[PDB]
Amino acid sequence: TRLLYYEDAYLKEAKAKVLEVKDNALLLDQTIFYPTGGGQPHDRGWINGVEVLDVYKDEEGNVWHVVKELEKFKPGDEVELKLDWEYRYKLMRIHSALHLLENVLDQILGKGNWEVVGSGMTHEKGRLDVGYPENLNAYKEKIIELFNRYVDEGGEIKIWWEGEKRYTQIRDFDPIPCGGTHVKDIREIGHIKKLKRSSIGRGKQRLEIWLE
Ligand SMILES: [Zn+2]
Ligand SMILES: [Zn+2]
Numbered sequence: 001t002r003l004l005y006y007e008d009a010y011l012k013e014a015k016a017k018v019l020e021v022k023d024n025a026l027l028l029d030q031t032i033f034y035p036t037g038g039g040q041p042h043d044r045g046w047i048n049g050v051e052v053l054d055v056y057k058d059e060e061g062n063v064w065h066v067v068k069e070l071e072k073f074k075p076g077d078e079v080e081l082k083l084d085w086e087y088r089y090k091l092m093r094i095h096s097a098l099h100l101l102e103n104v105l106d107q108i109l110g111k112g113n114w115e116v117v118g119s120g121m122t123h124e125k126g127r128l129d130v131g132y133p134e135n136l137n138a139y140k141e142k143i144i145e146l147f148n149r150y151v152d153e154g155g156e157i158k159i160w161w162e163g164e165k166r167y168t169q170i171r172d173f174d175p176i177p178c179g180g181t182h183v184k185d186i187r188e189i190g191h192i193k194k195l196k197r198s199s200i201g202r203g204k205q206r207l208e209i210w211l212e
Helices: 085-109 140-153
Strands: 013-021 025-028 045-047 050-057 063-067 078-083 115-121 126-131 157-162 165-170 192-201 204-211
Touching: 025 078, 078 085, 085 115, 085 126, 085 140, 085 165, 085 204, 140 192
Parallel strands: none
Antiparallel strands: 013 025, 013 078, 025 063, 045 050, 045 078, 050 063, 115 126, 126 204, 157 165, 192 204
């Protein structure tokens, strides 16, 4: 599949051709719908005004779109794609926030002194599970301050590829390899509304992040 969302994360609408109709799902030649991966949920939206129920990649890498009304789709149809942009852009803000939070933790705790244990997000909040001994409640204020300062200063998020791995880099910070859709500039993330730390195991800590 041609993954238009990796050519332009801000492409909100596009046209596509139906290649196959298999299992309540449409295979398109190109798509703007992000399929589930990298901790980021799949996009919501509409194809010809029909609700999209799921977007996933098959074992060959191609993207299938489950639709709620199959009857009006046949191979060869030209269809109009429309993202649920409110949902997509909130996920871009939260995904980029998780990257910025990682870079902030490198600055404050030291690269190599902590580990990412897991990562995920919803429309509501992002989750970064970390391996670090000391209770991070003693660092929360400084983390929030530095995060918000970088948001205020701004900075481009650059994208490139190395093999099958997509890389993103905020400003000159350490690059972070992962799939998913990011804002263009960290000014768009906005300030932290809430950062919540919890213990999830010995030396394992969950950071949950909500944006304004
Ligand atoms: Zn990521
Ligand atoms: Zn603010």
